């Protein structure tokens, strides 16, 4: 098996508050953008930015994953770039959500 994308989605907005941290949004379409995963997203030519996610947490609780297509605020390890900048791409195993 490959490890495929296991949560793509489209930046909403990020969060460089002085009291929160960079809490990133994103819309998915595709497997699930959970904490334990990894995440890329890209701009219009390049990649903005790579790495994991730092935190999960939507407008309603510390939600673990968004599949289907719910988007939730998560922050993306030490995002350089904020404020919706683009697409991003979660990528790992099949261990994910449950490990």
């Known amino acids: 098996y490959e490890e495929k994308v296991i949560g793509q989605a489209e930046v909403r907005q990020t969060f460089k508050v002085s009291k929160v ?7 998915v379409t595709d497997g699930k953008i959970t904490r334990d995963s990894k995440v890329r997203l890209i701009r219009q030519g390049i990649v903005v930015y790579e790495g994991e996610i730092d935190s999960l947490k939507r407008y309603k609780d510390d ?3 968004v599949a289907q297509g719910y988007e939730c ?3 993306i390890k030490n ?3 904020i404020k919706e900048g683009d697409v991003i791409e979660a990528y790992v195993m099949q261990e994910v959500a449950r490990a």
């Open 21 to 27: 941290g960079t809490i990133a949004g994103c819309y």
């Open 63 to 65: 939600v673990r994953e």
């Open 73 to 75: 605020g998560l922050t």
């Open 79 to 81: 995002f350089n770039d």
